[PDB]
Design a protein around this motif. Sequence first.
Motif, PDB file in Angstrom:
ATOM      1  N   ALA L  12       0.823  -1.202   0.000  1.00 36.71           N
ATOM      2  CA  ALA L  12       0.000   0.000   0.000  1.00 36.71           C
ATOM      3  C   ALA L  12       0.861   1.257   0.000  1.00 36.71           C
ATOM      4  N   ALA L  13       1.843   1.328   0.901  1.00 34.56           N
ATOM      5  CA  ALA L  13       2.612   2.556   1.074  1.00 34.56           C
ATOM      6  C   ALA L  13       3.377   2.922  -0.190  1.00 34.56           C
ATOM      7  N   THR L  14       3.889   1.925  -0.912  1.00 37.58           N
ATOM      8  CA  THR L  14       4.640   2.226  -2.126  1.00 37.58           C
ATOM      9  C   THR L  14       3.749   2.768  -3.237  1.00 37.58           C
ATOM     10  N   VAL L  15       2.425   2.649  -3.101  1.00 42.85           N
ATOM     11  CA  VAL L  15       1.537   3.203  -4.116  1.00 42.85           C
ATOM     12  C   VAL L  15       1.426   4.714  -3.986  1.00 42.85           C
ATOM     13  N   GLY L  16       1.805   5.274  -2.836  1.00 39.45           N
ATOM     14  CA  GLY L  16       1.766   6.713  -2.648  1.00 39.45           C
ATOM     15  C   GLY L  16       2.816   7.472  -3.431  1.00 39.45           C
ATOM     16  N   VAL L  17       3.834   6.779  -3.951  1.00 40.95           N
ATOM     17  CA  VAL L  17       4.859   7.427  -4.763  1.00 40.95           C
ATOM     18  C   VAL L  17       4.357   7.768  -6.159  1.00 40.95           C
ATOM     19  N   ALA L  18       3.184   7.264  -6.551  1.00 37.10           N
ATOM     20  CA  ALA L  18       2.643   7.572  -7.869  1.00 37.10           C
ATOM     21  C   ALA L  18       2.331   9.055  -8.018  1.00 37.10           C
TER      22      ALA L  18
END
Lengths: 38, 129, 83, 215, 55, 29, 46, 83, 72, 72, 72, 72, 72, 72, 72, 72
Positions: L12-18
């Motif tokens: 989930a957290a790595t999707v915030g880099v989009a």
Amino acid sequence: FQFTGIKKYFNSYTLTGRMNCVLATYGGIALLVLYFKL
Amino acid sequence: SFTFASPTQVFFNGANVRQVDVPTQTGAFGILASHVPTLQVLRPGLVVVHAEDGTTSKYFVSSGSVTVNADSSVQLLAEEAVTLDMLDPGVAKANLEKAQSELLGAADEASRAEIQIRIEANEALVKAL
Amino acid sequence: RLGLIPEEFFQFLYPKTGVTGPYVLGTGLILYLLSKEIYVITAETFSAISTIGVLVYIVKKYGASIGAFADKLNEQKIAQLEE
Amino acid sequence: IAPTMMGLPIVTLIIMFPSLLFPTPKRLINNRTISIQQWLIQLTSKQMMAIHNQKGQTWSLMLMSLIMFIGSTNILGLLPHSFTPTTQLSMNLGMAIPLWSATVFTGFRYKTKTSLAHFLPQGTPALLIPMLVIIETISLFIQPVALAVRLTANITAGHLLIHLIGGATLALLNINTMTAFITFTILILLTILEFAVALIQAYVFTLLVSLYLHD
Amino acid sequence: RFRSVISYKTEEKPIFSLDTVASAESMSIYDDIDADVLRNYQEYSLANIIYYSLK
Amino acid sequence: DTSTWFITITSMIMTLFILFQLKISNYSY
Amino acid sequence: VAYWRQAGLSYIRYSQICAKAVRDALKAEFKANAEKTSGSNVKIVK
Amino acid sequence: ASVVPLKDRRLLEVKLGEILMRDFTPSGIAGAFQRGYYRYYNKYVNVKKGSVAGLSMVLAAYVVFNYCRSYKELKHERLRKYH
Amino acid sequence: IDTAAKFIGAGAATVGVAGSGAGIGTVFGSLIIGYARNPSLKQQLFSYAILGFALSEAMGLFCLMVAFLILF
Amino acid sequence: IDTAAKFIGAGAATVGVAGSGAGIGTVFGSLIIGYARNPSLKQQLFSYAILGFALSEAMGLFCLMVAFLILF
Amino acid sequence: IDTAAKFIGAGAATVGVAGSGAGIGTVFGSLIIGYARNPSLKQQLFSYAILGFALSEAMGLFCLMVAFLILF
Amino acid sequence: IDTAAKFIGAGAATVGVAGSGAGIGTVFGSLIIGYARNPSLKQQLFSYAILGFALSEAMGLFCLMVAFLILF
Amino acid sequence: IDTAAKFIGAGAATVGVAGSGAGIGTVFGSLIIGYARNPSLKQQLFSYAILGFALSEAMGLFCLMVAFLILF
Amino acid sequence: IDTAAKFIGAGAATVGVAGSGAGIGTVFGSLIIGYARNPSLKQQLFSYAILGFALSEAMGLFCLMVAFLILF
Amino acid sequence: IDTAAKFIGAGAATVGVAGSGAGIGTVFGSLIIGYARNPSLKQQLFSYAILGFALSEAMGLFCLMVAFLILF
Amino acid sequence: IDTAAKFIGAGAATVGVAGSGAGIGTVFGSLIIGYARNPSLKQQLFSYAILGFALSEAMGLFCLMVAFLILF
């Protein structure tokens, strides 16, 4: 005798710069809270 | 094909400079020998003409028109276009500060806007000089 | 490059056969590095920054630092000299 | 599966080290290695003093030291095993709060009424005035934490990414082409990681903007 | 209009000083035409043609 | 790994600030 | 539309003001040419 | 004791990155660090531009000190010597 | 398990504050580009810019308050 | 099981910074074009850009603070 | 478990308000640039901005009502 | 369970880099139109573009730092 | 467990409402700058603005139909 | 169970890499606008567009590397 | 529980259509400002606007189709 | 449970299609505004939009491929 090198600047800008007491109070309160957790 | 000339003096006639920057009323624009055809009103500023050769030219101009057609023919018409050397930087700063002082003198909105034109021209002159 | 490498190899072989110097320490540095790699040095996260960062610094020094030396000497010194 | 460790050695020696990297000779002509430092100091000082143009320019002679220190500490971290002092949240927390407090108290020392009136953006809709006021005061109180985090988090993240990709390369005993490609990615990242200087610029410029707004 | 030392021509040149008549099918190709910019340009062109006719 | 404690890290920075400002005060254009 | 436009100032007046500023910016060595360009000969008949 | 460290630091500054300053300025111009980037014993360091030998030495010393500090946490792979 | 769902719902709920940041960035950049043309910053331009910023921040903090209510 | 819920909630709360990144990118992108149109950057043309960055990054750090609170 | 489902759904459902915030920011910013281009502010320039803001708020409120239905 | 939480939270957290990717795309795109309108590439047109890229990359990496913490 | 899945599925599908809000905000905002450029507002300008708003809202409602279907 | 976690994380992680798709879209669109204004493909426009697309795709591939770390 | 997983996956896959709504809103807004700048109405302007709408909504429809496939 | 995890991961991975839709909308909209700006559309102007689509939608299809692989 390095004090006299920046003595004028010291009291020139710390009139509000030397509010590190707020930082010390915040750090002490945080440490006390963590020790309560500790 | 650059057509740059004042009402009294001629700078470039059909010159293939291929690069001209103009102080437009709305802002700044750059001609690249293929720029979209448009009509641009000049603003107090300097026209930095960049020839096809590495050498460039800097002329401070008054208000006027930047007429770039579909072709490369650009007819730049400046009312008072002179090189920066003919101007005086000291007189430039003096005029700028005097105009800033007299900006509030003109009670009329139109007259204060005119003095604002004056201060804007002097600021562009200071930046150029 | 390759031709210079053969010339350097021939020069080293000539020094290796005899002395031609006061006990060249380059072999000492190479052997010390080999011993360190064998025993002391640990090859963990080395390619991360030990190689990459040093390589970037080498590119900077062999590249724009030549111009930086000019920007120091022929610009900073001569300006105050003229002043 | 290697646990990342931003360990805490004897901090004082590491922290004091960047200071020794800048000598200050008392000569008319410098040593062609302090000269570049002097030129950079002047170039950055002009940029920082352009906005202020007030009696607050006295603060600029300290903000120059601040930017020099933060840049030196962060640039030295790119070394193989260097421990970034700014990685730890402690010192950046101890830097953000005192300087923001100094800015706000300098604002409250001179033209205090107007300094507090800076919350008013010259009118604005009265129907939403309480909402705007609470929003802006919460933002002002957020600002020190924001300033600290926007430095600490990315300074740590650069080292974290370097460690992760380096461990990937070391563990990649497979096809050497993939290893070479990942090493190229490492070098590209480290070139990008040299932009930590831009982080110094952002931090110091935000501090300057806050000080100019309040003074 | 001056043609030669002995010959001259009484020439007539139209002036489209109105903003609306300035806008046409060709102005679609021209960028940043707007309304005020074209108006000021037309006024300056009127001044220019007056000066040229005077000379 | 994660930052805790926060005792002496935030104390040496003030001394380093003093040292840096004293050093750069000698620097002049 | 600007501070001058739509407020009582014609664009010709804008050009006059900026041209006068440029002419005043010129040094006294080139002031003769600026005076030559400056046209005050035409008067008004009403 | 600390006087000896200060003298050593001054000597290092004079050797690399060096009125009476005219002698010090000529000493810096000569660049003894530039001549031998890896001291007199060796030939030179990999970087060969910018007269950056002294800064390279300082950075290398800092790197090796931090490696000595970090050696406690890190561990080897094989008890036998590496390839 | 109910507290677990409260935690996950609070975590998922605060995501809505993201749109507030994008809207604020958009409105401020638009203010920049508009002022680039018309030098009238001390006018209704900055007033409406503040209005839009306040609306976006209020929406974001409303979502944050919903997340907090989920948490508690 | 509550530790697992805190983990997933913090992971979900972290994704709420994407709006902050979009906003900062948009505002600075409009800053470059605004300077390109009008070469008066040193003015409010850049001051308001900095202000918009400050007021738009607030959502991202707020969401990450919520994520940290969930995690700890 | 059912209340747990309600909590996680309400946390997930309320994120739809982020797009409403982004749209509100875009609307106000485009209003800014439009007024910068032409000074007919008291005309339908403000009316269209109000229309866009109201529709974005309506979409966000519908998402909020969906979240409420999930919670209750 | 806890390891599953670590994995899902990181994902989930790595999707915030989009959002930071969208921001860097927006600013680097605006770079090109700024350059097209004004051929002053070496100037602040590119300087502030690099500044914005660094700022948005910071907003993204300071997000993925949370994912890194979650994984370890 | 299916009834537990209903709420989380409904919340997950509600995110699509955000895109509709962003789209309607964008189209309405462009109408503002369009009217700013050309005073022929009541023409196909406003007609196509309504068209785009309606299409964006139709896409959003079509998305929310999935949530309404899964919930029942 | 941990394999299930890896599957879920890989599902969630890869979306962040796809969010960068909008970034390259904005880059190419701004390239469209710039080439429309001053048509010169060999000019720095194409280089800037390539650099922006490369940076956005680098963000995406770094998120994908995080996803691979989740998988392994 | 497999039905629950299909439901939650379909709910998750429904999000990917919000971007379609944002894209169609942006493209229709562009069409608005282009028609404002250029009186050309039924030329390649409108046809390409419809083409972009069709492409974006087709991508969204494919995402919803994948969501349905997971659902059924 | 493995099939359940693959289902939820594939559903989550389908969110990445949203970025593709926004990117396609942006590129086609900028194509529209460029064509309105200049009649050189049939030149490399249209080819640039084609490439932007073939890149952004390629990233979207890559995300879709990841979703399919997770599903199978």
